[PDB]
Amino acid sequence: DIDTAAKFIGAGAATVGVAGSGAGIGTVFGSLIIGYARNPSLKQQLFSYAILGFALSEAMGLFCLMVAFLILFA
Template sequence: MQALLISPAWSRCCTWGLIWLVSASFLNSPENSSKQFSYSSCPLRVVRWEFQTSVVSRDIDIAAKLIGAGAATVGVAGSGAGIGMVFGSLVIACARNLSLKQQLFSCAILGFALSEAMGLFCRMVAFLILFAM
């Protein structure tokens, strides 16, 4: 439940549609239907605003989380393909010029690390979508 404080001056200068959106739950709630507040006795009135979610809405939210996490893990497959390309290119380069093996291997390890990091970032985003939101 949230409580909003609205001043009388603010409610007089705003349009009726905005005031109705904010204060509809306050005016229609059963505990406040018998009470009448006057602006002269209370400088601020408290508006209670409750959000109600249905079972269908929660199911849609869970489905959206699962779809988003699945879409975020596509980058892991791309990381695997990138690692395969790096080491495939290393084998081809070493077959062409064996004297550059050590220098090529250090470049290949750098490419492997960058490609693996992107896969881990994608996995981290998937876990954030699933468990943090």
């Protein structure tokens, strides 16, 4: 089943896109740390924005994960 081997390699290649999400979450929470050390009064809204950014940048990696899964199972 060359198609099985191709599916395996396809999932392996398509799951590399989680690197973008990892780097994105790193940047978001580094920015949160700095922007909080610069203005602790705005802690609530800074955390709200950091959570929003995490949600989106993690979605952009969960998309790659779902693509890898459906390749492995379609």
